[PDB]
Amino acid sequence: KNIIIGAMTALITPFKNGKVDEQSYARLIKRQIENGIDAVVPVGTTGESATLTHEEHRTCIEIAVETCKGTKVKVLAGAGSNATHEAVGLAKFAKEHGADGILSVAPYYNKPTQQGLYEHYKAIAQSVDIPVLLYNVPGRTGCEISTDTIIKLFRDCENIYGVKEASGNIDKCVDLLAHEPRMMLISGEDAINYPILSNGGKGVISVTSNLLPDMISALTHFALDENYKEAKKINDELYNINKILFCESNPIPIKTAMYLAGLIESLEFRLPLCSPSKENFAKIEEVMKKYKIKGF
Amino acid sequence: KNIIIGAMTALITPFKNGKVDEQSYARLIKRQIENGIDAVVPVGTTGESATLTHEEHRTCIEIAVETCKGTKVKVLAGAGSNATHEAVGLAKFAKEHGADGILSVAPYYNKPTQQGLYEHYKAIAQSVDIPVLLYNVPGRTGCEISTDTIIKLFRDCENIYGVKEASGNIDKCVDLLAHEPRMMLISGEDAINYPILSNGGKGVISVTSNLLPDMISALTHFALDENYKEAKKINDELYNINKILFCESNPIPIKTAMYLAGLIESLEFRLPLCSPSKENFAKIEEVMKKYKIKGF
Amino acid sequence: KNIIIGAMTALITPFKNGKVDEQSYARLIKRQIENGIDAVVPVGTTGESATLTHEEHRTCIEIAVETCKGTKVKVLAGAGSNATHEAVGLAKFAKEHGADGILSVAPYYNKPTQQGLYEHYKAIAQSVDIPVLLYNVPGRTGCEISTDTIIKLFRDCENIYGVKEASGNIDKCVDLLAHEPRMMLISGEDAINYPILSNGGKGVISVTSNLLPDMISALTHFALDENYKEAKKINDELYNINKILFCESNPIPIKTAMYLAGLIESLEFRLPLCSPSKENFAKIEEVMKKYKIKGF
């Protein structure tokens, strides 16, 4: 019943001259380790999994795996895809190269049925013997992993242990944990980190933690120790940055914040992702000032 | 800032031969008082505020005040309307007839602007000197009281002390209490009662409490005493009843349950409200059996 | 099946000193008569049906019926309400006082089921012997009259002859007219007047016609005579005014336009409706200069 919980980070993927900055990628992973982060998620939605080639996707799981060798920090590698043969491929690469588990996003664009989602995830789970965390973000995929399908996959496949929820649907998180209380519900939405943890959630996969890993790690651990008045206190402080980090489509605002804080050298994206508007740029710079950003 | 918080019930309005049954109305109020309920909300959305004549709206506030005289139970009278001159009339009647405060639903159908909503509520509050609780349910009104508008009304009109949220948006309730922590956030959605209380909410205006007032009252008091593990446990047990009470439009499922429990004489509505479907009738009867329904 | 179709206007209700300007009302309906309008709709959503008293609602049907006598222009009186006893009351007043038919909006706020909508409209239909036109606006009522419910009411009720659609759902209007081609589909959305008429719709109940009755009247008859390129050309010229007349909630922009054109003396609303933002005021005045506004 292997799980990966606690404070986790959906790592941004820095670019340098149109190639992956492998130097800076490892240097951002050591900033997360030294600020209380329990696990890192390479190549998620925040890692621009869509514009990376299969070798770049694979190269940044390997960099993640060795950058956390000799630490407690686990690697929950992003291995999702809208094609099952593609998702199994990323899952098999992650196991054979030392990953502690995989995050697998619901298939996007092709909108599979609930029966399709079941067989999609069942094929991935049986491909490996490492933990598998589901990932539901219907605003991005066009499809919903129903509560019944999540619970069925948790009960029918032995390495499927929970779901990364990014739904803004607190009703579904009461639904999930009331009918299946043994599952690990992970928040994928920074604004509601504390409410999800306060209802029995056991971790977060955060975007803000790229910028403020100490604050996000403190929030999760306070909540897991049932210290809910301090957990809510950090969640209230983080609301302004949590919402302005979505003024444009993630990960455009967070990479802007990392550039403004000097944590990445160049504000580079891969198309169709671009730098934000000049107005929103000013709004990112203004919200950052109310927080104390840790350096290297 | 005079407040009305705690476990509250949006009481159903029983009909007999298409006229308001005034004697069963009072007998449901000693069932609520006698099971730990802290306040009652006469003629809300659950009370069919839209289908009562102006005298029946007023007569059911009078019964609530009279039946709660000599007790600790307050009366937060429903006084909302989509016409401001109509809302001021009900608000001043509520004070002049002994109500401790008023609930005021956002104007429906006429979809006012944020400036209109500000002036709408600014006009009501200035009519009375008793607490005024806002009520935001955009799924039924077609308009939403913005987070800024709620906070502005809370800060500018002294008797306006909080809001009954039934938006199903936990992000908005972090938004409200992180920027204005002195406001009384009231849950208007039974399925997510505990998460709203766990984030600093100070009460509920419940539909489920019509049938199980002791459980809903226990949930709120557990949470207000910061016993979040027992509050969540009741919230998880109540999920099935909380959602099956909305398989059809409120208050059709709850009135069906009250009739099945022998607490009201007739499964009677006034059009356009009708008895539920044949199928949903069976679903209410089936979910009720897993709960212990307290009598008179 | 007696019908009321063609180019129709949802009349604005002018106020002076917080009262209904009854003589500016009659002179505004006669501006509509002399510009090709086939029927007038007193006290619709554009007429602020929500803030008028029940006697003021009745007074503006009387003015509408009286002004149209001796004309070929029909009066489709607004008689909808979220309470069936209120809608039947208005329906019987319209028949007994000379209206040619009634418009009845879907019940708002209390969200009846499809079974409730059937009994609601059937009770209204058996109330009178004049044509009854349904009115579907889900953005404001929170409920929708399904295609199946509309078709049943058309087939089961003699005087029920069609539906005013304001959903922005051209799929539903293909659904309606492909399965029941004998019904009169009326456009309730000015921007898509021509597409709805081009698919077999037989009229519009317009907001823009308050300001530009000649263009809406020309558009409808061009389309009804199957002159689709001239109907489409007028619909294309009117797009800019059709959409900016909803930059704020109707009838706030249209009353602003009527005031700017000197067709009403005071830009007065009844709360919670208010005058528009100062920006939208400037942008309405800006779009208006591209059209030739007919006087009295």
Place this chain on the structure above:
Amino acid sequence: DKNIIIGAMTALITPFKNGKVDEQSYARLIKRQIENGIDAVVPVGTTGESATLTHEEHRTCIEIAVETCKGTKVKVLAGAGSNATHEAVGLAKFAKEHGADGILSVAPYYNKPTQQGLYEHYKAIAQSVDIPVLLYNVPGRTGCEISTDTIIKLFRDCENIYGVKEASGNIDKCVDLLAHEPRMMLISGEDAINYPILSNGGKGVISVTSNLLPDMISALTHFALDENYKEAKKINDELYNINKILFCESNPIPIKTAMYLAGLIESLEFRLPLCSPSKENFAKIEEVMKKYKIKGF
């Protein structure tokens, strides 16, 4: 000024046999469309399961499409979309170099970029090739919407962007588009509302129903383009029930089921996460089909 590909078009299904592309049924399904009045074929779209095909299989079905439409008036508007711009430019350049008459490019999915990103995304695609490029907006599946302003700006700034295949169920947006930019080719991507889009100035459809009933879809489009809206609307009303039942589940699950039930494909095979429909929906597809007479090969 602009080169376009309009008329009655078909979003081709991709038949599978034992987990690979049945290349001989693919060519025989495009050869069924040609003789039934279809003006162009769209290989490997959303209906073609572009997401589960390898890049080498995606390219193989553009090649089959180009060869099968040689000697005929039937054009190839090849599916070349991707959520990665370098991937979309790759598919765009392959299509030109291999004989396609144009490319369809879906709005980037999942990464949901901003309007500025969509502009630069499509400008890179348009400048990679010199053949027409048709935009494709389906927000229900991609999570993003190409605003009216971005479509119009892309139409005016780049030669080969000549229109958009709309699948939004938003007739307001199609009045917005053609009232402010009437020189663009608006293509319906939603079979139920083919006629309303054509009646407002649309100049073609990229159809799913045409996979099963190409003659009816072809007659509908040409009736509408000849401004005979009473026969065009009559066919659109006749086609509504099948137009709706082909989406009881997510496309292309119902359409491939219908093709299998009609004996036009041999195996009801998908690539995961796409699967066979429920037995319940299976029965509802079978029953709506009988009220129509399906042409064979």
